[PDB]
Hints:
The structure is cut from a larger assembly and holds chains A and B.
Chain A: E1 29-31, E2 37-39, E3 56-57, E4 62-63, E5 70-71
Antiparallel strand pairs in A: 1-2, 3-4, 4-5
Chain B: H1 2-7, E1 8-17, E2 20-29
Antiparallel strand pairs in B: 1-2
The structure holds one RNA strand.
Amino acid sequence: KKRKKKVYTTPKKIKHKHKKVKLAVLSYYKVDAEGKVTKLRRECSNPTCGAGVFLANHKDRLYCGKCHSVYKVNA
Amino acid sequence: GQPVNDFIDTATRHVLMRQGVLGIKVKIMRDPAKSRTGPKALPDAVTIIEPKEEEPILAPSVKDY
RNA sequence: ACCCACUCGGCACCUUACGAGAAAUCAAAGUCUUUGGGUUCUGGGGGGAGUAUGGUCGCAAGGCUGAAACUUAAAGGAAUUGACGGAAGGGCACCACCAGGAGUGGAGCCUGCGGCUUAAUUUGACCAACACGGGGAAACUCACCAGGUCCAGACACAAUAAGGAUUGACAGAUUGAGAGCUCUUUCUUGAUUUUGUGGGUGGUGGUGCAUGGCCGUUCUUAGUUGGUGGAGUGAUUUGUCUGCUUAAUUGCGAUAACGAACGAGACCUUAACCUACUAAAUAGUGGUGCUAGCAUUUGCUGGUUAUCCACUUCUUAGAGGGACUAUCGGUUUCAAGCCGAUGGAAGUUUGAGGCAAUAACAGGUCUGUGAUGCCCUUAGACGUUCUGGGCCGCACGCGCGCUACACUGACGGAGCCAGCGAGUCUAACCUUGGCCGAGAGGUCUUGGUAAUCUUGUGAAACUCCGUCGUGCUGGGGAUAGAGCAUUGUAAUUAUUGCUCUUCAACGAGGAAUUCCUAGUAAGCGCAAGUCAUCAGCUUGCGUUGAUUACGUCCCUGCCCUUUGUACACAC
């Protein structure tokens, strides 16, 4: 058995690198001139999701990110 | 033969040397006369008890009681 | 003429070397480093080469005399050990032959090997490879091929980094894939990581011609080796041998050897005997013993320590016994032994195995190993996983095999007997019985972790009665079509099983060539290994059971001795 050089018929495939979003949580809260804070995203109805899980906003769904659950606006 | 299973013990060890592996085999035959299990001698070893023969007597006698 | 004793001269011979020699050997080849009696001739590593040239003799053939150039590290002598011999002698082996049996080689198929083909058809091996790698591969196995994931990147350092080094992911695109592989909008996580440099780790990657271990073979033979002594300058030799004997370097013996060691033998396992011991409801047997069935002078049975009482012939397994060639006859030169008969369960080492020396082989294995050196690779991996394919492909050649060519048979019915095994709660193993089904199978239970049940494994050849009737025929069952089941995630390139249908070659097989001497060959099945399924394979086991020969060295080889050698990589 003699091995030969490995040639590839398809180009190389680069591996995913984590997307760097600088200071993401600031766009998840808002405070007024008084000081009261409120959240810009709803939370997971599932108990083992977290009160600050901050369901992501997508085109037509809300995605948990930890529970991997998808909710809608019309519920 | 069976006296190998009785009186021979062996062992093999691999020795990791810088150039390779050296095999070591040790074979030991213990003296059959020792130990307290199985046979105490080789199968073909024969011992003869010395007769301890005495001199013959000439006068018949009785030791009555 | 002969005999005896001398003597001179001669051809020689035998023993031994005090001596000589490199030794073979030598009475000269001695009186030679303690070197000188007289004298002639010849040689100076091997070839070129007794060649060229000149001279000379000869009728000629040729004789005598006789270089150089050039080339080369040995050539050569005598012995030693081995090996070899179409050398001799003595033994031996059915992996030899003889007398034979059963075959194989011829047919179809199964399986391994080469070749061809291919994306790959992974690979090792060529008596001592080729149903071998326990290699009966759907996935796995897997080592190959087309692709897709992951790091299972220890540890250290530098860099980045909670103002986030990094992890994962719903949906869609993409993809063989419902792999967030990678994208498209964004959530989660939080120093565990990431990047670079060193270092590791894995590799069925290479090298068995770097190795360990194991295995095979030389070699199934009887062979092998120290000590002290003897011979030789020495390598080495003797011991370890003429003869006889033995399966045997087994012994009787002989003896410059003596005493030893290994191997052989002894030993161990298994098979055969024990009316003798110890017993047994997980083995059996008996009891007008108990109970009950059938047929009538009582036989065959069913439940029997769980419905009892005895016993150990059969079965089991502990302890033992038994054969030691015993007795007798013959024969050898007493002896070692050998032959025959008797007795005996057994008289080939009682049968068969297990174990098994020294020295080896570039024998096989790196693809058994977290045995392993070195080299190569190490994130687009040769690491590890997933899907699919391949290992099985087909003008062809070879090896091991299965089924056959029929009447000493095929088919049908009936009869009807083994031994060696194995089996589940660390879960689905061995399965009786009942029911359904033509079958294969399905289903409800049941017993068994087992001398208890499967199982008396009611196996198959075999026996009886019948059909067939010498016709490639009801011999043979290859190939092919259709359907029904089982195992499994998956059965297509048919896993296997079952049913119906098609019904090929083959009429006993050239040259050749294998195995075997008694419960053996051969026929016949069964269990185990493999294993989810698959046994035309192997390892064992039993059932039925011949012919032929108790020999030889013709062939092929083996052992010992002598002998020759220009061989030692050893004909």
